[model samples]
Target: LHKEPATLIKAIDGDTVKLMYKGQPMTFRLLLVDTPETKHPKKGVEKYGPEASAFTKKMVENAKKIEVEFDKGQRTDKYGRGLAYIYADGKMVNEALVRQGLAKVAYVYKGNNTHEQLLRKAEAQAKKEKLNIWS
Candidate 1:
């Protein structure tokens, strides 16, 4: 994993965000999680998308600090956006989203399977509770 200290510039959605890294701006797609689509040009609004986005915004905004860890296998997606696991105040933002039922485990890359089991367990709990999108 390649780690970097980053400042969250914006939460584009639940699964994507913009950040400032080393005096440069970058966009990162959160690895191992996919929230509902809030701004897909063609797909339009999806259920719980706004809520997920709002939750993500709250998490990032409330955090005292933020960092990003890029996977070793493939750092960027086909679109050239970085694939990362975001940390806010030392907490894993990706895991938080899944635990809250605001997102689901998806598009998992091979190199960054570190938290896969934990996220899956969190997702199962959220699904059982019928929270947010799982409802």
Candidate 2:
């Protein structure tokens, strides 16, 4: 597939981005990962909520050459949006976001996981290192 530049319009927490792809408006949920909720009743907020969102926004905003990978099952989410593993510059953007502490691992379900281990490792490392949002 060809890579192209895209702008992030909105962030649905840390693992999801509302952006435009292929000249069409859409929402892409980063798969195989989960981030701590900035505003959740039980979980409350993590170390850096705004910072995490800001960092993610900066990473995706006007970014060029973004590669998206698909999984075996469940392409669209509940809202009927494409679910993919995002990549930029040969790095896993979803995992990178969590690894950098800009997002958290949100593995609430178990089904058709393509990058489960990677996401888990990244989250663990991020927590250990105490990256951006963690600090």
Candidate 3:
């Protein structure tokens, strides 16, 4: 696990963020969380997609600090975006999304899952409460 401190630039969507990493502006696709489509060209805007992006934007914009955590596998996705987990201050953004039912646990890879259990547990809790997607 490699964690690097980053400055929050913008929340492109719920599952994607633009951050200043190592003095470079980079876009990161969150590892295990998937929110509805906000800016996807083909997908257009899905239901709750705007809400997801709004929530993510608030978290990052008001964050005390942020960091990008990379797993042991592929660092970049096919979209040329960096793949990692994001933390806003002391909060795990990916987990928070799932916990609130704003996102679902998705795109898991064998042996490359560091906090997969954490995410699923949060997702399950949200599902139990019938939050968002579960609603």
Q: Which candidate has the highest TM-score of all? A: 3
Q: What does candidate 3's lDDT look like per residue over 11-100, in tens digits?
A: 889888999999999999988888998888887998878988888889889998898899888889887899888888879888888999
**lDDT (C-alpha) at residue 114 in model 2:** 71
lDDT measured at residue 30 in model 1 versus the true structure, 0 to 100:
89
Compared with the true structure, what per-residue lDDT tens digits does model 2 show for residues 1-135?
A: 234455456666666677667687778877866655575677577666666666666666546656667777777888677788776655677877778877766664435477778788887898888777566
Inter-residue clash pairs, candidate 1: none
All candidates: TM-score: 0.92, 0.72, 0.94
Scored by lDDT, model 3 comes in at 0.87
lDDT string, candidate 1, 1-135, tens digits? 656799988889988899998898989988899899888887789988898899889989998899998766777888878888899988888998999999999856867777789899999999999988888
The candidate with the higher lDDT, 1 or 2, is 1
Assess candidate 2 and give its TM-score to the true structure: 0.72
* lDDT score, candidate 1, position 131: 88
- Specify the poorest-scoring 10-residue window by lDDT in model 1: 107-116
Candidate 3: residue pairs that collide: none
Cα RMSD (angstroms) for every candidate in the order listed: 1.4, 3.5, 1.3
| Count of clashes, each model | 0, 4, 0
Worst 10 residues of 2 by lDDT: 1-10
